[PDB]
Every structure is written in C-alpha cells, then in structure tokens.
Amino acid sequence: KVTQERMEQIYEEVKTPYKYGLAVAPTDNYHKIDCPTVFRQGDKWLMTYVVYNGKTGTDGRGYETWIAESDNLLDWRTLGRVLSYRDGKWDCNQRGGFPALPDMEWGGSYELQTYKGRHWMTYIGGEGTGYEAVKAPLFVGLASTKGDISTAHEWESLDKPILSIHDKDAQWWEKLTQYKSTVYWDKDKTLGAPFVMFYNAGGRHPETDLKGERVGIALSKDMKTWKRYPGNPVFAHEADGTITGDAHIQKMGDVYVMFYFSAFEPSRKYKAFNTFAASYDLVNWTDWHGADLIIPSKNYDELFAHKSYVIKHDGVVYHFYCAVNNAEQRGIAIATSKPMGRSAVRFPKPET
Known part of the structure; x- marks a missing residue:
C-alpha cells in the first residue's frame, strides 16, 4: 500500500482548487459534450471529446468524437470530427473515442505514442441509439491513423469490436456493458x-448481487487480441449502483x-465527483482518504463534476472534467x- 504520507503528497501535487470554467460547451440543449482526452503535438495542445446529439436519454443518435486545439490549455477551438457516425458498420450510432498510448509521465511531454507507424484510439461503439444506447450493451472498438493527429480527420477503425460482453472470456464485472477504455504502452x-487497457464496465457482484461500474484490465501484445487480467476487477467501490x-x-x-x-457513492452527498488512487503495481490501489479533487460547486457543475484528464505543465495543474448542471446541460x-482567470464560456439558457 501507498503510505498515507505519500498519498497526501500526491494530493498536494495534483489538486486543483480553482475553477477556470467551461472549456468546451454545447451551443444548444440538444448536444452534450464529455470525455476529454488532452495531449499535444508540436505547437498545439489537443483535446478529443465526445458529443451526444440529444437533450434527453433517448432523443439523440449517439456519440461522435471531435477534436479541439489550444495554445494555452485554457482556450479551445473545435476543429471537427475524428470519429463520425459510420453507416453500415457495427458502430454506426456510437463512436466515442479515447486516444491511446499517451505518454504517462506526470508533467512530461503529454504526447501520444506511435506504434507500427500509427497513432491509436479505443472507443465506445455500437448500434443502439440514445445516450450510451439507453443502457443496452456497447463494446470496445479500436481506431488508428497514419494522419496528423492535430487535425480533424476521420481515423480508421476495425469492422468488429476488440472487446465485448459476448467474448468467451468476458468476466462477471463487465457482463452488462463496457464503457471507457484507455490503452497504455507499458x-x-x-x-x-506491453499494452495495458484500463476500462470500466457494468456488472453485478456474483456473491453480493450489487450492481455497479468497476475498473478492470485487459492485456495485449499487439493491440488486436486481448486477454482479461485474471484478477479483475482491480478497482471498485462496492455499494449498490455505485459507479467507479x-x-x-x-x-x-x-x-x-x-x-x-x-x-x-453513498459516502458522498454530491452525486458524482473526481478523486484519485495510487499503486506501485497497477493492480492494488490505495484510495485517497481526503477531500475529493473535483466536486460540484458552481452553477455549471452543480449536479455532476466528474470524469478526469489531468495535465501538469509549466508548474500548473489543469484538471479537465465533465460539468453537468441540474438542467442536465453537459460540457467540459x-x-x-x-x-488562471475566468472563462467567459457559458451554457445556453436551459429548458423548463
């Protein structure tokens, strides 16, 4: 276990008390923006993000993935789509991507690594429409590109998922659906x-019957064929309905x-939040015991202040997250x- 002292040092290193405000916001109520991944190449910082094109759980088609650029990590300009609705394919209605192989060094280059001459990305994919397919199963897809990742171009993707709830070796903790994945080059x-995927998924505990989302690992030698870590799930909070x-x-x-x-999470009164855990071995995680890193506190994140991507650069930590208010307006x-100042970006007026 990581000592309480080391955990406190990590907290002080990574905390971000000061909310800049919205970075990437929808301009109407029929788009929702989520899932930042921040990286850089050359003279631009880059953020991929997902857009769901509905107001409610059921009206939108599903996710597409977009990219934005920034010179300073704070002010962002959307460039266009990188994963678009793909008619005729397995993932036609849900294409919600997470770039892979990030340089993992805290305060480092924040570049994405190339493998076999390509950059890589996993995604939430499938055919069900609505917000994350209205609880129906979605699957882990793989995309890649030889293109300039700092530009809005369509990445290439496989015509079947790389992981699924239907796989022979699918485990109890991922039987209902799979959500975000990220592949690391270790x-x-x-x-x-060499390729380690951390992903969250839904399932019911086989003994206690508690439903939740938990974090587990899959492993690959080549990005294509995957095996589950036998000790999954590696990180969970066991309470009924709790999401990790x-x-x-x-x-x-x-x-x-x-x-x-x-x-x-029953121990927090606020409905969604960000915090951290730490590990020496990638399997046994020590959960932070102090204040959560991001919690609802402004009008724009008063319902959920959640999902993370964290950049340390030039002595400043930037914690990107998904802000949801009580009107269910959703942005980053x-x-x-x-x-570092205050964003002028705002959500549009909410509906009644």
Whole structure:
C-alpha cells in the first residue's frame, strides 16, 4: 500500500482548487459534450471529446468524437470530427473515442505514442441509439491513423469490436456493458504485456448481487487480441449502483496515480465527483482518504463534476472534467492549481 504520507503528497501535487470554467460547451440543449482526452503535438495542445446529439436519454443518435486545439490549455477551438457516425458498420450510432498510448509521465511531454507507424484510439461503439444506447450493451472498438493527429480527420477503425460482453472470456464485472477504455504502452511490461487497457464496465457482484461500474484490465501484445487480467476487477467501490470509472493513469516515478470518477457513492452527498488512487503495481490501489479533487460547486457543475484528464505543465495543474448542471446541460470544464482567470464560456439558457 501507498503510505498515507505519500498519498497526501500526491494530493498536494495534483489538486486543483480553482475553477477556470467551461472549456468546451454545447451551443444548444440538444448536444452534450464529455470525455476529454488532452495531449499535444508540436505547437498545439489537443483535446478529443465526445458529443451526444440529444437533450434527453433517448432523443439523440449517439456519440461522435471531435477534436479541439489550444495554445494555452485554457482556450479551445473545435476543429471537427475524428470519429463520425459510420453507416453500415457495427458502430454506426456510437463512436466515442479515447486516444491511446499517451505518454504517462506526470508533467512530461503529454504526447501520444506511435506504434507500427500509427497513432491509436479505443472507443465506445455500437448500434443502439440514445445516450450510451439507453443502457443496452456497447463494446470496445479500436481506431488508428497514419494522419496528423492535430487535425480533424476521420481515423480508421476495425469492422468488429476488440472487446465485448459476448467474448468467451468476458468476466462477471463487465457482463452488462463496457464503457471507457484507455490503452497504455507499458514498455516495462509490468503485467507481462506491453499494452495495458484500463476500462470500466457494468456488472453485478456474483456473491453480493450489487450492481455497479468497476475498473478492470485487459492485456495485449499487439493491440488486436486481448486477454482479461485474471484478477479483475482491480478497482471498485462496492455499494449498490455505485459507479467507479474513467480511469486515467499517470506515472510519478514508481507510483502510478489513477485519476477516476465515481457516482452514486453513498459516502458522498454530491452525486458524482473526481478523486484519485495510487499503486506501485497497477493492480492494488490505495484510495485517497481526503477531500475529493473535483466536486460540484458552481452553477455549471452543480449536479455532476466528474470524469478526469489531468495535465501538469509549466508548474500548473489543469484538471479537465465533465460539468453537468441540474438542467442536465453537459460540457467540459477546467480546474487549476492556481487562479488562471475566468472563462467567459457559458451554457445556453436551459429548458423548463
């Protein structure tokens, strides 16, 4: 276990008390923006994000993935789509992507790594319409590109998923559906494979029958064929309906830090929030015991302040997250370790 002292040091290193405000917001109530992944190439910071094109759980088609650029991590300009609705294919209605192989060094280059001359991305994919297919199963897809990842171009994707609830070796914790994945290139092969996927998924505990979303691992030698980690799930909070998800891992030397979100956790009065855990081995996680990193506190994030991507650059920590208010307007906001100004970006007026 990571010592309480080391955990407190990590907290001080990663905390972001000061909310800049919205970074990427919908301009009407029939789009919802979520799932930031921030990286950089050359002179631009980049953020992929998902857009759901409905107001309610059932009206929209599903996810597409977009990309935005920034010179300063705070002010973002949307460039266009990188994963679009794909008629005729398995993932025609849901294409919600998460770039893969990030450089994991806390305060490092924040680049995406190339493997076999390509950049890579996994995604939530499937055919069901509505918000995340209205609880129907979605599957983990794989996309890649030889293109310039700093531009809005369509990445290439496989015509079947790479992981599914229907796989022979699917485990109890992922039988209902799969959600976010991220693949890391662990050249040290800590878990015996170079490609390590952390993903969250829904299932019911086989003994206690508690439903929830939990975090587990899949392993690959080549990005194409995957095996589940036998010790899954590796990170969970066991209470009925509690969500633990969107694992985002960075390395502070020997310590891995998992930034994650939870929702409907009985020990927090607020409905969704971000916090962290830490590990020396990627399998046994020590949960932070102090204040959560991001919680609802402004009008724009008063319902959920959740899902993480964290950049340390030039002495400042930037924590990107999904802000949802009571009107269920949904966009991406930023918190920082010191005040960096205030965003003028706002949600549109909510509906009655």
